[PDB]
């Protein structure tokens, strides 16, 4: 198990969703763990961007996530937060997938509230972090 450290301090309005998203991911996968701490690998910011929330990342634990206010009020915020965090873990967007695929993100619409990765998503994250 590899530990990726994040900094949630610049997203004051989303502290509980970030904590919720990190726990979902920690309770779903074996080879990587997310923990809040100093000298962080990636960080969370918040504001307004009509394209919604996004991740600026190398796909292997680093960069930052921007959480948009309107998207997190119209869609379930834990799903939004957990989805964007999936990008930092290495998973790509797959907009045509169903609600049970966390990486389909907003594709299924606002009625989709599931913040959990499916079995294939979890399996792929374990493979991407198996050797660090």
Binding site, by residue number, is: 76, 78, 83, 87, 93
Examine residue 93 and tell whether it contacts Zn ion (CB under 5 A): yes
The span of 7-15, 55-63, 77-85, 96-104 binding Ca ion (CB under 5 A) equals 77-85
Q: Are strands 63-68 and 42-47 parallel, antiparallel or unpaired?
A: parallel
The dihedral built from the CA positions of residue 79, 84, 88 and 94, taken in this order, carries a sign that is positive
Any catalytic annotation for residue 17?
no
Interface region with Zn ion, contact rule CB under 5 A, candidates 3-11, 35-43, 64-72, 86-94: 86-94
Q: Does the protein bind Ca ion through residue 49 (CB under 5 A)?
A: no
Residue 49 contact among Ca ion, Zn ion, none, beta carbon within 5 to 8 Å by kind: none
Which parts of this chain interact with Ca ion (CB under 5 A)? 76, 78
Which parts of this chain interact with Zn ion (CB under 5 A)? 93, 105
């Amino acid at each position: 198990t590899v530990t990726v450290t994040y900094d949630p301090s610049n997203a004051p309005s989303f502290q509980q969703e970030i904590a919720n998203a990190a726990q979902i991911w920690n309770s779903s996968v074996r080879n990587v763990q997310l923990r809040a701490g100093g000298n962080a690998d990636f960080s969370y910011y918040e504001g307004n961007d009509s394209r919604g929330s996004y991740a600026q990342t190398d796909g292997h634990g680093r960069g930052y996530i921007f959480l948009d206010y309107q998207q997190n009020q119209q869609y379930d915020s834990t799903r939004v937060t957990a989805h964007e965090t999936g990008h930092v873990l290495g998973l790509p967007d797959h907009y045509q997938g169903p609600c049970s695929e966390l990486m389909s993100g907003g594709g299924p619409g606002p009625s989709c509230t599931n913040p959990y990765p499916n079995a294939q998503e979890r399996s792929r994250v374990n493979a991407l972090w198996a050797n660090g």
